[PDB]
Amino acid sequence: TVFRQENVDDYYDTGEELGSGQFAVVKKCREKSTGLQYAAKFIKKRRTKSSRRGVSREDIEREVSILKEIQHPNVITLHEVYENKTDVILILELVAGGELFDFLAEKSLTEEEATEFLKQILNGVYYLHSLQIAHFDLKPENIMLLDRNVPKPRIKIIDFGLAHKIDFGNEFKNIFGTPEFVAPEIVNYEPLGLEADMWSIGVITYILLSGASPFLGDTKQETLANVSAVNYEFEDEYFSNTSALAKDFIRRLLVKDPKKRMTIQDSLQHPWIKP
Ligand SMILES: O=c1c(O)c(-c2ccc(O)cc2)oc2cc(O)cc(O)c12
């Protein structure tokens, strides 16, 4: 599939850079014809087939295809796609309140504040999983706030760079995200499904409540080893006045066997969450 090959600068003016990762750089931008603001993500293309610099066209096309499907208040939306020899440029919805990661670093939350973020994440993931989309990279830095100067910030899930449509209950691709948040099936290179996202939600919940990362070791390999062995515990110093139902929620997500792990529907019916 090809994208718009006119110069993006003829239609948009760029401004503040919002951040960058290994292959993408994201800049605030404004569409000239409407004055409406967006986030332009510039994704570096592979220059040769055997290269490992840049993103393969197959991976870029998968991300765009998934993004085009989604319209939900808790997930980022895609406006337009441009490309040139060097980059594919995704014109995305602007979410300007910054990362949940940075929000947590400025402030530990209450269980109310924790559940208010978590419930939105769950609703967003419920939508994705209903469409058989596994995100595969759920973590606080991939959660963006619309406005962080409000008591109960609204959030949107971003970064669909590892996302896959799961048409057969599982996928068996490369797929490996951030060690602190990946499920044991990812660590062990086993077939992956929607269950992996639910493990990541358990990790996120643990962090939301405690300010600590449950499997984090001194090196990347230690963290991965901890994940595979389900080496975590609720430290009393962090959790002594956290409700037992909150711990039960996390406990039923941080389960090695994907089949025994809570699904997104289970998580919404869990007594800690259910109205
Ligand atoms: O740093 C990043 C970032 O800020 C954003 C972003 C911010 C606001 C939006 O409205 C949309 C995206 O996306 C990203 C996507 C990546 O793959 C890697 C990144 O580093 C970012």
Q: Where are the domains of the chain?
A: 7-97, 98-275
Q: Is the dihedral of CA 209, 210, 212, 214 positive or negative?
A: negative
CA atoms within 13 A on the CB side of 115: 17
Cα end-to-end distance, the chain, whole Å: 44
Say which experimental method was used: X-ray
Specify the fold of 7-97. Phosphorylase Kinase; domain 1 (3.30.200)
Active site residue 147: no
SS3 15: strand
Specify the fold of 98-275. Transferase(Phosphotransferase); domain 1 (1.10.510)
SS3 225: helix
CA–CA separation, 114 vs 212, rounded Å?
14
Return the ligand 1 atom nearest residue 43 CA. 17
**CA-closest candidate to residue 254, choices 219, 228, 221:** 228
Q: Is the dihedral of CA 121, 20, 40, 151 positive or negative?
A: positive
Give the relative orientation of helices 111-130 and 195-210 as an angle to the nearest 10 degrees: 170
- Residue 155 sits at the vertex; the CA angle it makes with 164 and 3, to the nearest 5 degrees, is 45
Between β-strands 37-44 and 133-134, what pairing exists: parallel, antiparallel or unpaired? Answer: unpaired
Does ligand 1 lie within 6 Å of residue 100's CB atom?
A: no
Does ligand 1 lie within 6 Å of residue 92's CB atom?
A: yes
Kindly state the tokens that stand for 174.
């490369």
- Helical segments of the chain, H only: 57-69, 100-106, 111-130, 184-187, 195-210, 220-228, 236-239, 244-251, 264-269
CA–CA separation, 96 vs 272, rounded Å?
30
- Resolution in Å, one decimal place: 1.9
Whole-number CA gyration radius for the chain: 19
Query: 137, 197, 236, 266: which one is catalytic?
Result: 137
CA–CA separation, 80 vs 53, rounded Å?
25
Same fold, 7-97 and 98-275: no
